Amino acid sequence: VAECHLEGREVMMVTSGAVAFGKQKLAQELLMSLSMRPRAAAAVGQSGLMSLYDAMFAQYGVKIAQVLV
Amino acid sequence: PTFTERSQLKYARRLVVKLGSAVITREDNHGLALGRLASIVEQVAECHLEGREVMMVTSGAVAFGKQKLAQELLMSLSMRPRAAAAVGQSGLMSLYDAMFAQYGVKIAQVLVTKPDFYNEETRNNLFCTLSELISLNIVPIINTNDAVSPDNDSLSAMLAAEVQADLLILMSDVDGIYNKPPWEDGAKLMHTYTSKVKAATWALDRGVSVVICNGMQEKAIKTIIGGRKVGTFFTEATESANAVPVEVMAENARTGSRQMQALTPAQRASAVNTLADLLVSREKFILDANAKDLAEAQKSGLAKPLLSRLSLNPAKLKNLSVGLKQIAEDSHKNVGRVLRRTRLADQLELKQVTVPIGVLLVIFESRPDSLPQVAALAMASANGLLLKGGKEAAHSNKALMELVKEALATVGAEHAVSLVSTREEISDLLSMENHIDLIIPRGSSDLVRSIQQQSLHIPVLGHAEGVCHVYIDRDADLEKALRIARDAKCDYPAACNAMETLLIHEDLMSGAIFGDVCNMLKREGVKIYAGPRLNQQLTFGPPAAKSLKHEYGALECCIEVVPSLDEAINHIHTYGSSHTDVIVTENDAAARQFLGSVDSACVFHNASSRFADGFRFGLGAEVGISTARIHARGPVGVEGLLTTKWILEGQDHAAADFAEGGGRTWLHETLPLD
Amino acid sequence: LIHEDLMSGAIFGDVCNMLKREGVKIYAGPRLNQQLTFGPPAAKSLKHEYGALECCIEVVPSLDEAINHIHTYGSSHTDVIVTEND
Ligand SMILES: N[C@@H](CCC(=O)O)C(=O)O
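^ Those are the sequences you sent over. The predicted structure of the assembly is below.
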């Protein structure tokens, strides 16, 4: 994607599946709650995933900006 | 809601913050003021780690993104807002993540908008998201979905509403709400309360406690959670009249002073007579009241000083009655008395007279015996008076207060007296101004010390340290000094006017009188230390004194010896609090030497430090012991509460009339003063 | 500050004339603002300070009212009374 953009074409990723990010990131509180007791994990994963994309893309110098719809 | 007073605020389990768009951006909206933001996140992490539940609502992301680009906005404003806020949203989120995680707490961005509260299915959805979050020890940051946006405060309010949160904190730039625009006399910062204002009403209408603080104020949360009077608190609970918050008290008292101003001739005299009569007539009520409150104190078992002084016996009441009758009979010509009578020129008759001070405020620990004494002082001195005791005696204080309110009601009838109970927050009390004149602390070192450390920009009568000194000269009779110091220490060794030191001529180490007085102190069981020079002197002797500027109160007395008069003088000035001292000798040359050289508040010659009682001076009933360098030294009677006021009754005189034009010259003839 | 009665004898006008003679930028008190048609401009704030040739002027009904205004605004610095009743 960074390549096709650096070429000069115009791209707008639509990354599905943030839930997995957050699900992994907690991995402890879901553990301790499934013994004493989904979307929220996706919210926290949304944050983290965004950061990760920022790091990686910026390593090509391109900048990004989260958009929610 | 349910909470009513700032006292209740240690008991809210769910909190919501909403930082303002001005507390975080620096004074450009073109960057980020960080220190404030850091303070905020630290306080928030604290309140959460406590176990309370918090959901920040950080406004103002635009500044983050605006700074982060700073280059493309540059290159576009030469070839050509919300987008910057989106990118800033991302970055700001990361930053919060780093910082919060440095306390171990985790967070999770959440985006909403005002329409998202209006439809009900989304209400369900978002509330489910929030509950699932809070259940997991996560602090969601709640920004608005700028993306869908044409100051986000209504948002936080109605958020707390849907959540039905305990307390909504709403930080901001302004300190609080005033009575009126600030460019206006009477900008009374309305701490409680019977734009932001509307939204606050709204949230209150949703059964929600709201508070609006100032961002720049440190520890604002930790401050406001304590119950401290800060920011602006909102509740119409309006339980009681609670006649004065703090201040209409003060103005009233001013009015009452103005009132009694026109009641000198036997008026206040007969009034305090009436007070003494009420004291000696209805004592049963107040006696049982103190018995009750003393029993209440017993289960508490606070302090044998307190647990001893809060006592009261009808003998004490007889003492108070005779003291009050004395004050009455002798308090005849204290006010209005003229001090100068002079004529500058024909029909130019200046004279300077006696006038009250104004709003006196006493402070003392539970000792209801003093209360009527100082009340008699006020009333005979025709000036207003406030009061604040401690915790105990409170009911006794009320009884005495009613008695004295009656007593003043007879003539003049104006209640130029009050009482500030229910934990008025002494520091806040002294934070006032423009009303109170003389802080008259009365309890003990602590009390007065805490005061002097807390008091700022307000006159504070009284001292804090009782380091006195006793010099003994080479030509002083031995047994004389023996009995003298014997009493000086062993009459009420916990007094203020005590000799926590004893200085002796170098010569008299030879006559073993040092040994004799050590024997005497032992007789009385006095833990004595030694001076560095004394440390050098003997083999091991008594142990070395810790510090020369220390205080004992109990049966302890440092002892040190120096060569000469002048050396003693210098040591005094170096360590003495200029409070009190005495010399014992038979040379009057040296006597006068000392007399002058000394700079104590009061100095004696062959007498006892325990003489500093004012009453002992025939100085009427004392009010305090002042060591300040102005207006008052040590034993202050009533006249330490009287200032002067120049008055002048000309006929047709003017300023330039005494210039070369008008035949007006100068006489300054000291008329016989009345 | 001037008694309310003496607004009738136009002495207010006389002293305005005098201040003009001396070139004194005078303001007016809220009560005085109410009093005349437009007159001198309204005083900004009663607890303000001028130093230069300026002097707010205001009139109140009674002695005691004046006293209260003084205590309200006066810095307890200095004052004088002019009258013939002792
Ligand atoms: N966006 C506005 C409200 C928009 C509206 O619904 O009128 C706010 O957050 O205060």
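The interface with chain C takes residues 185 of chain B (CB under 8 Å). The two ends of chain B are 66 Å apart (CA to CA).

Shout if you want it in another format.
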